[PDB]
Amino acid sequence: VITREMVEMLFSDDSDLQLATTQKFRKLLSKEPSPPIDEVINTPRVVDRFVEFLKRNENCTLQFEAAWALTNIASGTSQQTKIVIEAGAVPIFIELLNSDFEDVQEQAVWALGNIAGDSSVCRDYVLNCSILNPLLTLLTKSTRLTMTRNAVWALSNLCRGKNPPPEFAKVSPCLPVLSRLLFSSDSDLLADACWALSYLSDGPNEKIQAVIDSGVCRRLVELLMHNDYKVASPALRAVGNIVTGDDIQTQVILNCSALPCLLHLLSSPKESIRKEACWTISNITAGNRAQIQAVIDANIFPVLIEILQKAEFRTRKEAAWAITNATSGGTPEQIRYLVSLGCIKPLCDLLTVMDSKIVQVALNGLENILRLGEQEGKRSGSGVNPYCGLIEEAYGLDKIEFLQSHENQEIYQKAFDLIEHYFG
């Protein structure tokens, strides 16, 4: 507990007792798992007193201890970080980034990171205090690995968030620094940078173009094969987000030789990586016919069909999305190739699952295949849809019929349309 002597000494006038009491507060606040944050911040003027000590540029130890206590306070709930923010500490921490004491600089970086990572509200508060430029200047002139780690972590926190997202113009001046950071060897640095890039690349294609222009694609594709999962996972997220852009932006990643790496990742021992790789490939196959041809020539679709009929439902949903996108924008010959691999049966087997989204994707895929079957039957003049009999051999016709009683309107309206147009 905080003693009445502690409070009296914190507000004393002798720097010695001030430092001793601030150190006592910091040590109590650094206690886990239940720090006494509420008791401290509920003591009136104590947080204000720490923020006042932050301005004691003559005492390096008092500055450092007060900054550390405020960091511990900011490591709690949002309402406990609000007290640090409302005391006016963010502008002081951003000016302490240029302190002559390296300890104070690192502690201020850690505090601003904690504050920025509490919520999107605190993130935008810190950004609107003009932190990016001082932070980027400190990150380029750092002589401590731990300080660079903390600074990159705080930068990532400044870039994270989608509800709401940060104003891109306030976080995009950092994309040059992250591109250079991707060339380091520290796994923590690479991981935080990849997370920042994954969030900066999640959005409209203009943000993706900004990320591409920084020249990060080759390095991210290389990091896809990183041994440390904490680095490969965010890198795969970033690549998958990038391949959601137009066909040129996706072609950049494809030219970074990403399809072979994605193929290897499809055989990962972790279902999360397999799901994310399937999702990336589905974004790719949603592109033009050249990128679908690239996925074909990469020998990826056989593995996707295996996944479609053996993996977990979360991964099979993405594999089905990949196959269906391929059938949607592919040529008759490419879809003939997909059918020759035996995709109709694993797609029909998914019409009986509880996830209505998987059912809808499978239905759309079968619909595309049947549409091209009808077109080819027209060209032949025989009226023979060659792929109708294949859906019959899969015992999928009665599955489509059963889907007319589904609760989802999209599914049961799509099930009636198929039976009416193709199965007459």
Numbering used by the authors: 80 to 503
Lines quoted from the article behind this entry:
In the classical nuclear import pathway, importin alpha recognizes cargo exhibiting a nuclear localization signal, and this complex is transported through the nuclear pore complex by importin beta. IMPα proteins consist of three functional domains, an N-terminal IMPβ-binding (IBB) domain that mediates interaction with IMPβ, ten ARM domains that recognize and interact with cargo, and a C-terminal CAS domain (involving ARM 10) that mediates nuclear export and recycling. The Trp and Asn are absent in ARM repeats 5 and 6, resulting in the segregation of IMPα binding regions into major (ARM 2–4) and minor (ARM 6–8) sites. There are seven isoforms of human IMPα, grouped into three subfamilies that exhibit specificity for specific nuclear cargo.
Here, we present the first crystal structure of human importin alpha 7 lacking the IBB domain solved at 2.5 Å resolution. Here, we describe the first structure of IMPα7 NLS binding domain (ARMS 1–10) in the cargo-free state. The cargo binding domain (ARMS 1–10) of IMPα7ΔIBB was successfully cloned and expressed, and crystals diffracting at Australia National Synchrotron MX2 beamline to 2.5 Å were indexed in the space group P21 21 21 with unit cell parameters of a = 64.85, b = 75.84, c = 88.97. The structure was solved using molecular replacement in Phaser23 using chain A of PDB model 4UAD19. The final model of IMPα7ΔIBB consists of 424 residues (80–503) and 34 waters, with 79 helix-helix intramolecular interactions (analyzed in PDBSum). The structure is comprised of ten ARM domains, each consisting of three α-helices H1, H2 and H3 in a triangular arrangement, and overall forming a concave assembly. Structural alignment using Superpose in CCP4 revealed highly similar structures, with an r.m.s.d of 0.66 Å for IMPα7 mainchain residues of 80–503 (424 residues). Very little difference in structure was observed between the cargo-bound and free states, implying that importin alpha 7 does not undergo conformational change when binding cargo. We found that IMPα7 was most structurally similar to IMPα5, ranging in r.m.s.d values of 1.3–1.5 Å, whilst IMPα1 structures ranged from r.m.s.d values of 1.4–2.2 Å, and IMPα3 structures ranged from r.m.s.d values of 1.5–2.5 Å. We also found that comparing the unbound structure of IMPα1 with α7 revealed structural differences in the positioning at the major site (ARM 4) and ARMS 1, 9–10, whilst comparisons between unbound IMPα3 and α7 revealed structural differences at both the major and minor sites as well as ARM extremities.
